[model samples]
Target: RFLKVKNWETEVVLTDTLHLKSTLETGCTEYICMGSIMHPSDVATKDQLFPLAKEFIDQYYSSIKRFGSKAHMERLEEVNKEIDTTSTYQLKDTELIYGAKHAWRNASRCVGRIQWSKLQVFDARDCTTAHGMFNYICNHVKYATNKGNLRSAITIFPQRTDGKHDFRVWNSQLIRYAGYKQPDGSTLGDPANVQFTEICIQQGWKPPRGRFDVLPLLLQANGNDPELFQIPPELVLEVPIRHPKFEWFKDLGLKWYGLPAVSNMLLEIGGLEFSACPFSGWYMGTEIGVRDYCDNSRYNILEEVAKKMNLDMRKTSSLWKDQALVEINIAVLYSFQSDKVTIVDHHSATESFIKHMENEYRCRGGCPADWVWIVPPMSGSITPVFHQEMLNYRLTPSFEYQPDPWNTHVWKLV
Candidate 1:
């Protein structure tokens, strides 16, 4: 099969105070720039890289007319509205394809906005450094999965990247979409020991909400020594990772094994049981952050910023707004289970939880206070500064309590 690629666009963003002209040259390829072209021929460039863009915008505008000016009214509903409604109630919604409302509802329990920071982006050339970083993450993961025979024989490793540009992955997706065999001759749904997800979540690593704060607290040891709280032996994560100079540098993507483990605890705490922890609020926060970062007039090159951000323009099939809002509300309800869990209200998160839940659940109902929750004791192993900020609470003891070194039995799954 033969396919043609259109000219690549040069996207760049500049702060008002900083004037910089930097171009990344890999030295292997020539550059042809893609710009905003009014004519179809200008866009094609003898190839069609953005064949779908025009059609996508046309459909989007059509939607504007079909749904009216406030068509996005429901999706635009603010989380803050719950505060106006009541002090402690939540909403619920349904899923599109994964019809499991229970799973969707359960996942929403522990979700809220989280602050994330980006250290680097994904680039193939930065593999060695990323490998080292991932090695550290893997070492910690190895220890967490260190349960008897499963630990002795099999070992997990990180992905290695060749120093070249590769975009053939989409073709792989197309084959799968058409129910064709993979190039590697492998069948779908087959069990394999070396699954990447297994290594990533070995010690409970998270999907990297792109924020250290949101990275499960359990991965971090209580002190500065990365090894102290890290898995494997001492000095494991001590091999310091350096931030890459090139914007095209990739992340090592390795993380402490504690992420998955902590999430496992959260599952019991919030009830997703065996799925990704919900982050409805965090998702919203990131959306707002990206929007602000992109649209703010103080910064130049707004269009370039969008291109650099690599915005995924795919429209989801699901169009029900009330359903999504209600589901988001239900998640707030789960976070508000103050009595059983000490929801870490970092950004007055507790208030956020309370305020958001009040809309759907309503007042004079079983407010958050009515539920039983768990809180860690003494801010155990936390840094002094964060430890001070970390709140602790306890279950009523009479309910779901057993004797085993105070809360030790409570943490262990038995």
Candidate 2:
């Protein structure tokens, strides 16, 4: 009833009905589905997309339990007729809204699904230019930032059909620090984003050469060359990292943005793909503290923080890493609390995720989750999810990761 797959093999397009019984696993020389019922068919090729389109129509109607009603039947006919001749059908505004919210609810990696109902979905399907995309993205940032009182929102850009042209954002996240490569071969900022930062510079962006410089948007539309656009300074809300008890922590020059807006993943609804949909939610403190700040590949601040606390760094027996990590997380929590920014601690977040799982299981017979990804980076066994069993499966009206635009698509094709 669950699936385990490596990221490299995950398909380019892929969903749910007769979902009550869906496993049709097959193994062949060319493809290895591993008994997965949710195996994807490339929507761009010779597939009959109308069936999946109808299934999506059914989902919209099913939510209202109005499936098979006159309205549902009419919608079914309308979408089929549209898809058959034109190879695509437009989602009504409300249908688009439902698809977005449902996609959020279906996201397997997020721990904040409890707030799915509260999202502010921006339908940006009307945008036709990369500059126009910048304006829409900026608007989303301001709304989601909400002056540090963060709100969950996603601004959906145009969905992909047989690709006359496609809309896309090159950044993995809407807000991230630029990583510059120094002559000494050390990264100057978040090492995680060095390649993206380089791409921006190559696109004629002036490198500010600052450690925490917020990166600009590399927006692409109509399969055109990606253009760089800077985010407005007034819209960015950043909180300085300060420890409640330690004055020295503030001297280390640490700060971070309030919103975690992810931009790279494509939105797949009813076989329709939103090649550039960006979604954001407030941070979970551990994401900043445990991963961003402490991960050796990223900030690698553990040793620095340990020295600030005068902890023994020569040996692992002193538990210096654990001590510094906890304090870092504490400072993260304290600063956010003092500044009135929204962030949840690991304990609280895991507990809420448990409740969300319960809610999902009650509403739907099963909820798909990846235990490996779901568990927090730190405090794995200590958290509740480590002891529980989870079933991982694919469901659509979902978000799927696509190859980066720079290396794979648009620019190369041109």
Best by lDDT: 2
RMSD to the true structure for each prediction, in A, is: 29.1, 6.0
What's the TM-score of each model vs. the native? 0.18, 0.90
**Tens-digit per-residue lDDT, 1-414, candidate 2:** 423222122221112122353332123224563333333443453255777787788989988889889999999888877777788888999889999998887776677888888889999999999999999999999888887788899999988765647888999999899998899998899999999998888879998899899999999988787888989988888899999999999999999988899999899887788999999999889999999999989999999999989998999999999999999999999999899988999889887887777666657755666676778888888887676566555667888778788776646433
Worst 10 residues of 1 by lDDT: 169-178
Model 2 ranges off by over 4 Å: 1-46, 410-414
lDDT for model 1 comes to: 0.22
Residue 339's lDDT within candidate 2 is: 96
What ranges in model 1 sit over 4 Å off? 1-104, 107-347, 362-370, 374-414
CA lDDT, every model vs. true structure = 0.22, 0.82
